[PDB]
Amino acid sequence: KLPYPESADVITANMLKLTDLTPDDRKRFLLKNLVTHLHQFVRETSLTTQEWEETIFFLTATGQKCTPLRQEFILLSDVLGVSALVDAINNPPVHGGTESSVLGPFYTDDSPDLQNGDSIASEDKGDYMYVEGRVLSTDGTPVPNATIETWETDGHGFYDTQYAVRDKPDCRGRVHADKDGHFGYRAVVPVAYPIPGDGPVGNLLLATGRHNMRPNHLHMMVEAPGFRKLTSAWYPEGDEWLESDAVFGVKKSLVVGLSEVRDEAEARKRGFPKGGSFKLLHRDIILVPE
């Protein structure tokens, strides 16, 4: 069969020939493209032995930084624009549906199940925010059996997993919308968010002259039987980082207003225990039938 891999040209030709053995058509195509690009990158850059070693070390450290609650490989994808590119290709603003946005590294399915009026945030975790809307079809009809996975930074600038003690989740939950599609829950106003700088991605951003900021945002991931899954986020207006999100997640249609309500009776009705005032985020979620 194949000649000894004596030269760069032969190494590439041999590896490309071996792609033929991949049985699955799609995986074969992906592998052909991967080899082509990997080999071109190495040849075009004349990657040094030391640069290769450093790359091995970085990728290893990236994987080793990952836990069930912090995905450093997602974060790497995010800061290099891969995550946003995949999102744009896969979820084109195609029907009248709420637009898609990046997941990011801090999603977990270890979040509490909640009914409407419950809170995703413990007390003393930031300025009160109430989030509400209806889950609707593009035809305007209510969507039953919808669940909203939602998560955010606390008002102090940290996701729950970035603290040393996590005895329970915080500033996240799985909210079950009602039969008429209505959802409503307590939360806190999210703050401009500095991406964690204590792993390989932080080092990459420093070495490449990048800031590490995301604008304020609230993740919204919605599923319902009969509808396409939406992964998205709302971005409160007026944040100085909206036009320079480090992970390219902001879209104009996902920028939202917050309205302040200073009515102690209303705050208590909504379940806020320390009363006073809250900011209101009212926005429907529009899903596309499957």
Residue type, 52: W
When the beta carbons of 210 and 268 are compared against a second copy, the nearer one is 210
When the beta carbons of 3 and 140 are compared against a second copy, the nearer one is 3
Among 122, 141, 203, 244, binds a second copy (CB under 8 A): 244
Give percent helix, percent strand, percent coil of the chain, each to the nearest 5: 30, 25, 45
Q: From residue 16, how far is each of 32, 33, 46, 290 by CA, in Å?
A: 6, 9, 20, 38
Q: Is 102 in the site for ligand PTY (CB under 6 A)?
A: no
Residue type, 275: G
- DSSP characters for 63-127? HHH-BTTB-HHHHHHHHTTHHHHHHHHHS-S-SSPPPP----TT--S---EEETT-BSS-SSSSS
Among 203, 244, 253, 259, binds ligand PTY (CB under 6 A): 203
Interaction partner, residue 164 (ligand PTY, Fe ion, a second copy, none; CB < 5-8 Å by kind): none
| Token reading at 178 | 């009602």
| Token reading at 289 | 């039938």
Q: Is 192 in the site for a second copy (CB under 8 A)?
A: no
Q: Is 38 in the site for ligand PTY (CB under 6 A)?
A: yes
Q: From residue 21, how far is each of 8, 164, 276 by CA, in Å?
A: 21, 48, 67
Q: Is 88 in the site for ligand PTY (CB under 6 A)?
A: no
Q: Is 94 in the site for a second copy (CB under 8 A)?
A: no
Which residue pairs, CB below 8 angstroms and at least 24 apart, start in 195-198?
195/75, 195/79, 195/246, 195/247, 196/70, 196/75, 196/162
Contacts with ligand PTY, 14-33, as mask; x by CB under 6 A = -------------x--xx--
When the beta carbons of 26 and 179 are compared against ligand PTY, the nearer one is 26
Q: Is 47 in the site for a second copy (CB under 8 A)?
A: yes
Among 159, 248, 272, 278, binds a second copy (CB under 8 A): 248
Q: Is 33 in the site for a second copy (CB under 8 A)?
A: yes
- DSSP characters for 30-47? HHHHHHHHHHHHHHHHT-
Interaction partner, residue 230 (ligand PTY, Fe ion, a second copy, none; CB < 5-8 Å by kind): none
Among 95, 156, 168, 210, binds a second copy (CB under 8 A): 210
Among 16, 82, 213, 256, binds ligand PTY (CB under 6 A): 82
Residue that the structure tokens 């991605």 belong to:
201
What are the residues binding ligand PTY (CB under 6 A)? 27, 30-31, 34, 37-38, 41, 52, 54-58, 61, 73, 76-77, 80, 82, 200, 203-204, 207-208
